[PDB]
Design a protein around this ligand. Structure first.
Ligand SMILES: Nc1nc2oc3ccc(C4CCC(F)(F)CC4)cc3c(=O)c2cc1C(=O)O
Length: 604
């Protein structure tokens, strides 16, 4: 049994969304077979609907046609089908439990801004903008395309409306943290009066408010949480956009013009991957393609506290000199796995990766379909976070090995250039100390030898202290990079995939418990499968956390502690080689004062 139209038909079982106004079924066309989103209302229109047909934009669900159902003669809207679901469906997946991927987050902000801007050009106010109103379609290139459609909700209401840019800030915060900005203890339900008190608390610059105890305080914060998977350079640019659109004061609200301007400023910036080799931290510099390298070094300082003049950059196994006027679009293309390593002559503290240390929540024995579903969602998102951090720690070590194996070659290049200047001074020394012996009033020559022999003696001390450094940059010479290959984790250990196997099992059990919650009750047979897999959900999470801490973190902290020592020994050798090379330049000119002095007397 199902309803039909002159051109479309849909099964009642293939129901998509169920709302107060209407329900949307997944239907097909009678003549083509193409899938459409059919909207059948349960219960002026002929004009406001045809004006929504001509609305053609990439970030707007196309309203194809308006037809009348056969049996009930109900107005039916034929809308574009979005097989991936809504943004809320995307945020329900455990991989996005603590925030969307950074690239996926930029697609959301681009489509949402690009969609409402087209709606403002036509003059349509959305009133309610939530992840449920933002559909997801896969584009012809494989990247997601987000669209608006339903043009509210309790959690996304303005404080004055609780009694337009507000719900947009709550959506972006939810998409970036994987959680809501203003959450009471027992959730926005019976603590609804607390939720209103949280919004009327208007801390202006702060964007979050977590009541971690029943009827307790409200933990405010102006920055994003540590679990946020966005880069630190993106949080710096995203925080002021939200804080200025999350306060009830229309006097202090931004409006769409300043909002669209500052958001367009973020999307027009290219990414330059920079890995602080001495701090063992990866960064992303959001810089416009027309900015100079001077502003680039400014952003590197604001993210690493490294002075611009001391920033020495490495790329693809060679040094990199950035001209202060070289535009950012002419920089070499960088990835997360091939960045621009930054090193400095000043000593830098070795920090590593900073992440939120979360433990497994306890599993309850109560057979509750809703409880087991909400429990399986949180515990699977925790393993996704630990699986995310594990791959980030592996990347940090692999980036560390390349940056160290490169930096030793860059130092061996500085050593070989010192040898070139040494051979220039040795050749000049010999051809001037012996050209005097050939010609050889006594004080004018004896003073030279007491000075030439002092040069050849101090020049030789450079040679001995140089071949010592050549012995230090040799294999096993108290500075080899062999320990990096024998300390932390490696892709050969396959630790990220060992955690990803247990993650898929936990996600399948989660998706099954998500189906088991839709069914109001289960049969005795299906009930014990739900209980048996609920116990396997704990054994999988316990096996993952054990392998994560007792292998991934221990090897990482052993590699990090070994890295902090090798950095000191490397900074010490760089100061010696620099002094020894400066001791070759000042004596290169000291032999320039004597090569022309007495060797060229005056006589007619
Ligand atoms: N045009 C629209 N297309 C829509 O396609 C959809 C396609 C698939 C799904 C499922 C959602 C939850 C799940 F079952 F677990 C996995 C897939 C939902 C929708 C949907 O909700 C929708 C709404 C509209 C609208 O305009 O409201």
């Amino acid at each position: 049994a199902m309803q039909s139209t002159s051109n479309h038909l849909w099964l009642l079982s293939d129901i998509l969304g169920q709302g107060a106004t209407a329900n949307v079924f997944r239907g097909r066309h009678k003549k083509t077979g193409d899938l459409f989103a059919i909207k059948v209302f349960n219960n002026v229109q002929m004009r406001e609907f045809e004006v929504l047909k001509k609305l053609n934009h990439k970030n707007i669900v196309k309203l194809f046609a308006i037809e009348e159902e056969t049996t009930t003669r109900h107005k039916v809207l034929i809308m574009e089908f979005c097989p991936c679901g809504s943004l809320y469906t995307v945020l329900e997946e455990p991989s996005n439990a603590y925030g969307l991927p950074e690239s996926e987050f930029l697609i959301v902000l681009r489509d949402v801004v690009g969609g409402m801007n087209h709606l403002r050009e036509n003059g349509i106010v959305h009133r309610d903008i939530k992840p449920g109103n933002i559909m997801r379609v896969i584009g012809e290139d494989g990247q997601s395309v987000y669209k608006l459609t339903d043009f509210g909700t309790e959690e996304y209401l303005h404080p004055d409306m609780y009694e337009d840019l507000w719900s947009i800030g709550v959506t972006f915060y939810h998409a970036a943290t994987g959680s809501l900005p203003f959450r009471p203890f027992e959730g926005p339900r019976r603590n609804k009066e607390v939720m209103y008190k949280i919004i009327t608390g208007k801390p202006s610059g702060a964007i979050s408010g977590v009541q971690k105890a029943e009827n307790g305080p409200i933990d405010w914060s102006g920055d994003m949480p540590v679990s946020c998977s966005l880069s630190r350079g993106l949080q710096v640019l995203l925080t002021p956009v939200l804080a200025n659109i999350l306060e009830a004061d229309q006097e202090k609200c931004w409006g769409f013009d300043q909002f669209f301007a500052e958001t367009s400023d973020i999307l027009h910036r290219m990414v330059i991957h920079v890995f602080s080799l001495q701090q063992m931290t990866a960064h992303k510099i959001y810089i416009h393609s027309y900015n100079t390298a001077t502003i680039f070094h400014e952003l590197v300082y604001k993210q690493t506290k490294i002075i611009s003049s001391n920033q020495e950059l490495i790329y693809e196994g060679r040094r990199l000199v950035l001209e202060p006027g070289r535009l950012a679009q002419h920089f070499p293309k960088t990835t997360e796995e091939n960045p621009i390593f930054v090193v400095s002559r000043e000593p830098l503290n070795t920090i590593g990766l900073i992440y939120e240390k979360i433990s497994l929540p306890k599993v309850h024995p109560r057979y509750d379909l809703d409880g087991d579903a909400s429990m399986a969602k949180a515990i699977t998102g925790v393993v996704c976070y630990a699986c995310r951090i594990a791959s980030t720690l592996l990347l940090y070590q692999e980036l560390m090995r390349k940056g160290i194996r490169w930096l030793i070659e860059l130092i061996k290049d500085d050593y070989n250039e010192t040898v070139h200047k040494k051979t220039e001074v040795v050749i000049t020394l010999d051809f001037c100390i012996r050209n005097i012996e050939k010609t050889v009033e006594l004080g004018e020559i004896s003073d030279i030898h007491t000075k030439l022999l002092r040069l050849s003696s101090s020049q030789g001390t450079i040679e001995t202290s140089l071949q010592d450094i050549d012995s230090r940059l040799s294999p096993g010479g108290s500075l080899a990079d062999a320990w990096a290959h024998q300390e932390g984790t490696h892709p050969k250990d396959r630790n990220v995939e060992k955690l990803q196997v247990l993650l898929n099992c936990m996600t399948e059990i989660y998706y099954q418990f998500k189906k088991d919650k839709a069914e109001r009750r289960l049969a005795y047979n299906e009930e014990q499968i739900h209980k048996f897999d609920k116990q396997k959900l704990y054994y999988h999470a316990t096996k993952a956390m054990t392998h994560f801490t007792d292998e991934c973190v221990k090897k990482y902290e052993a590699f990090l502690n070994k890295s902090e020592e090798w950095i000191r020994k490397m900074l010490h050798l760089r100061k010696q080689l620099l002094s020894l090379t400066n001791q070759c330049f000042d004596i290169e000119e000291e032999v320039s004062k004597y090569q022309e002095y007495t060797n060229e007397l005056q006589e007619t």
